[PDB]
């Protein structure tokens, strides 16, 4: 429904989708560290906005028992952490690819790319399921 953190994650998604095409332009930016620097910036923004959103949501909560509340808060924290780790895993996999190409001597990277593409598809599935889980928890977090 358009929170700042969701827009930030949206930027991350848009950039990752482009990286996933693995075109020659992508490959240029991967080999420089520009892609991983960009992903780190987008990741950091998302996390920052997520934490700020949670803090604001806490200004308007339905008062529930409190045992429940401490647990909803812990579960939300866990969900936030998962999103960050997921984004970092994407960046890390790209760092690994750059190292592999740099040790490659001008040889074909096609196989490396086929493997990277398959791996990123699975990393994206994980980040998306966690993002959806995080959103669901946030949406119900005010009530208890």
UniProtKB/Swiss-Prot annotation:
Changing residue 137 to C: In HLPP3; ApoE2, ApoE2 Fukuoka, ApoE1 Weisgraber and ApoE3**; ApoE3** is associated with HLPP3; changed protein structure; decreased binding to LDLR and other lipoprotein receptors; decreased in vitro binding to heparin; no effect on distribution among plasma lipoproteins. Produced by several tissues and cell types and mainly found associated with lipid particles in the plasma, the interstitial fluid and lymph. Mainly synthesized by liver hepatocytes. Significant quantities are also produced in brain, mainly by astrocytes and glial cells in the cerebral cortex, but also by neurons in frontal cortex and hippocampus. It is also expressed by cells of the peripheral nervous system. Also expressed by adrenal gland, testis, ovary, skin, kidney, spleen and adipose tissue and macrophages in various tissues. Sequence repeats lie at residues 41-62, 63-84, 85-106, 107-128, 129-144. APOE exists as multiple glycosylated and sialylated glycoforms within cells and in plasma. The extent of glycosylation and sialylation are tissue and context specific. Plasma APOE undergoes desialylation and is less glycosylated and sialylated than the cellular form. Glycosylation is not required for proper expression and secretion. O-glycosylated with core 1 or possibly core 8 glycans. Changing residue 113 to Q: In ApoE2-type; no hyperlipidemia. Coiled coil: none annotated. Changing residue 63 to R: In ApoE5-type; no hyperlipidemia. Changing residue 85 to V: In ApoE3 Basel. Changing residue 119 to A: Decreased binding to LDL receptor. Binds to and activates LILRB4 on acute myeloid leukemia (AML) cells which leads to suppression of T cell proliferation and promotion of AML cell migration and infiltration. It is linked to Hyperlipoproteinemia 3: A disorder characterized by the accumulation of intermediate-density lipoprotein particles (IDL or broad-beta-lipoprotein) rich in cholesterol. Clinical features include xanthomas, yellowish lipid deposits in the palmar crease, or less specific on tendons and on elbows. The disorder rarely manifests before the third decade in men. In women, it is usually expressed only after the menopause. This is Apolipoprotein E. It comes from Homo sapiens (Human). The chain holds residues 40 to 183 of 317 of the full protein.
């Amino acid at each position: 429904s358009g929170q700042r953190w969701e827009l930030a994650l949206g930027r991350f998604w848009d950039y990752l989708r482009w990286v996933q095409t693995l075109s020659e332009q992508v490959q240029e930016e991967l080999l420089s560290s520009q892609v991983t620097q960009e992903l780190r910036a987008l990741m950091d923004e998302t996390m920052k906005e997520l934490k700020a959103y949670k803090s604001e949501l806490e200004e308007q909560l339905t008062p529930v028992a409190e045992e429940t509340r401490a647990r909803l808060s812990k579960e939300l924290q866990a969900a936030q952490a998962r999103l960050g780790a997921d984004m970092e895993d994407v960046r890390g996999r790209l760092v690994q690819y750059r190292g592999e190409v740099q040790a490659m001597l001008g040889q074909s990277t096609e196989e490396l790319r086929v493997r990277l593409a398959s791996h990123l598809r699975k990393l994206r599935k994980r980040l998306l399921r966690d993002a959806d889980d995080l959103q669901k928890r946030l949406a119900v977090y005010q009530a208890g």
